[PDB]
Amino acid sequence: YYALSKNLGPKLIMMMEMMKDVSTFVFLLLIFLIGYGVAAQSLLSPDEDFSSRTFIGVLFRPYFQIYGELFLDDLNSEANCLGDTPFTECSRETVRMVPFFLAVYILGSNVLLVNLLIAMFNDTYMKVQEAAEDLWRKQNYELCA
Amino acid sequence: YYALSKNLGPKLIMMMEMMKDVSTFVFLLLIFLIGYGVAAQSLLSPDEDFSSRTFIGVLFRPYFQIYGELFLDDLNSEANCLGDTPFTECSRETVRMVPFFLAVYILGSNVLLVNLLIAMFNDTYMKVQEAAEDLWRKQNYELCA
Amino acid sequence: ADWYGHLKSVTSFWAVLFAFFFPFFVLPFINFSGAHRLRRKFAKFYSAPYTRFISDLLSHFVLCVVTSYFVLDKLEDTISAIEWILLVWFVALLLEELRQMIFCDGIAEYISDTWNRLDLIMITLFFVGFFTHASDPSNQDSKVVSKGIHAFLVVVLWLRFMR
Amino acid sequence: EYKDRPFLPAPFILLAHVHMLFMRLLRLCGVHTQEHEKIQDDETKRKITTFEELNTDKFLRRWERERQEMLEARVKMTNDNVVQAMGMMDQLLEHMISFRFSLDQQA
Amino acid sequence: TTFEELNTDKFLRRWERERQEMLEARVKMTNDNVVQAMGMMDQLLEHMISFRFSLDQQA
């Protein structure tokens, strides 16, 4: 029922056009999310049998770290590092690579992919704004009928 | 008193023009916020009488999760999940859908709606910058008078 | 048109994928451009370049899934069966890279490409990690260092999937 | 790239490698086989040739007409026409001065 | 019906006048006019050569 409005309706048509760019962003992020997630989960727990908890561990924290919620306190607790500095005096030296991988990952996801999505939206918006307005004007009669 | 300045004044006129895009963003987010909020609050507490606390629970955490403050530790405490992995070994299996709904929601609000607001601002800004400058020049005499 | 190997109904990802897995149940009931014909269409469909791409994707996807489980699950005190399968797979990949270097374009032409360099880095990482584990399979430290190298291996493998 | 690639996928490409090595050994040393291909008929070749020649002539005619309909070309052609018009007036003036002489000598 | 017919004729008249005021059409029309001017000069030259013959035969 927002489609009847001259402000909300064309914008809804534009949102349906931008869904392909959303799909492009999802396909590019999925690559980095599963790569970093399998690597990070394996690095944190290298002596554990595979279970359903391993699979959730691969997708839970990697996905929510791209929205700014960084589980660094939780990662620090799981790495068994007892130092005051965050990843020093650990039992295994390999788990000290856990913040570096993370350091690459959020550079890939937040600084690169999100900003490219912004660029794709602006380009897509400028391209299909007039066509969306015309399509809304045909749908105005369709809704009236 | 910022309106007398040649830099701050036209920008103020542009802000008043962009308020309609702000209203468009508010109407689109309101839909996702109340849908996700009622669903998530019901999923977390399925055996509680309706009260004023239920209504605050529907609007409090859903609104503040779109600014990056994700209450995942608080959600973990409310879900009564005792596992080390975040939503495993819970009393009810339905409450394990609480992070998935959230997973959809912040995809809708932060990646889709915020970036479309950025696209709408850029388009609106390019459209009404010269008219805002002319209107500021008429208001210059108005302020002098 | 050269893609799809000159066929009508082969147009989307799903149609070619469905026809690939189910050859006898979608190919006869589809538009075609006896053992004389079914064999000819089978030789044309699996001789198509798109079909080799689909086969390479599926192959690389299994490689990613199998290598991802191998690095997530704990290593045993001897060389496991999945480790031997991955060893055979990466030798085959290494021989294919060597065959392309010696018998196709040239070494300069091969190094120019960024994906060939990534291919070389992923084979190199797997062999360093595998020999690190295989030098002392019962050593706990060797298991930890081997999984550490293989974390980089999984990152490159999923990054190469973008090709 | 995917036209010349080995037919079998990666874990099984070793079979393809041993098959190519077997064909190379049988072709270089054994010489028990060769290569077979298909050659297009002369009818279809001259059919392609006729089509290409006809469309080449058609594009040149369309290209020439399009270049003559430009604004710059029309302004240039009208300008040259006005120059030719003066030339014809110059010839006219020569014929005029000839009568002037003829009429002067006629009295 | 009368309104629609009248406005149809009015649009056709406005459309024809607008197409005649374009730059390309004006350049083309002036060009054809210069061609017609030479044609008239050709007729003039025929009349001129006729006098030349008449004046030559007059002596």
Place this chain on the structure above:
Amino acid sequence: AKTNITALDELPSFALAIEELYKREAKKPHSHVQRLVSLSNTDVLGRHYRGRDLANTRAYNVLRMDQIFARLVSKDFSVNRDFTIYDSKYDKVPGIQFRRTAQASHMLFLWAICLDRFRMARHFWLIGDQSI
């Protein structure tokens, strides 16, 4: 020739004249009209049902062509013809000459659209009414 169908026998002389223009243009080599009628897969009165001799001697009648153009516009377009007004009993009705003109013009207009002759199409479009 006389036909057993009552709808076809009701048709005026000018409908047969338009039928002659369609037939004459259609008999020419590589004509798109013959392909359109053959690929349409319909019977003589235009109904989508797919003897033979009538169906071929009068294959370019006006009712069938009206049906073909109706399918070309949309799935529920159906142009209404009224050939009863061309009888001599309606001559006294005021403005009948305009109506007879308008309908006739429309049919000729559609024929000119089919052969892609824009100038004659524009001329019959301006003569008739309901321009838009």
Place this chain on the structure above:
Amino acid sequence: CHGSDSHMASEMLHSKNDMFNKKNAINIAYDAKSLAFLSHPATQSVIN
């Protein structure tokens, strides 16, 4: 039409014509998929 009399133009667009099974010009325009006609201000004014 919209330049001359907006109301009379509105009256013409609402007129039902017998030759095309008794429906108006906008219905025909929608059936003809004429996006240019439907996006015009006069047509939009009658739809509103």
Place this chain on the structure above:
Amino acid sequence: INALVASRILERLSTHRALQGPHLAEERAKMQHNAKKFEELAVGVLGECHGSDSHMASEMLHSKNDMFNKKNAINIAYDAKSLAFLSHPATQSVIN
């Protein structure tokens, strides 16, 4: 001032209840056209002044005229809603 007043009267007159009708359309159109022209004149002369002597142009814009209840050209321009005149650099220079 007369060009600004003329532009305002023609623009307001073209959109009025007295000029609506099927037969009055073209003249109405003419009015709008004429309005624009007068507006152009009002800008144009002003521009010329700013090219010749900026100070003397400033002196002319500040002059109070008795025929329109003793107030200047900028006040008339604001009353005529001439956005083009007010946005001009010469007018803005006198306002500043």
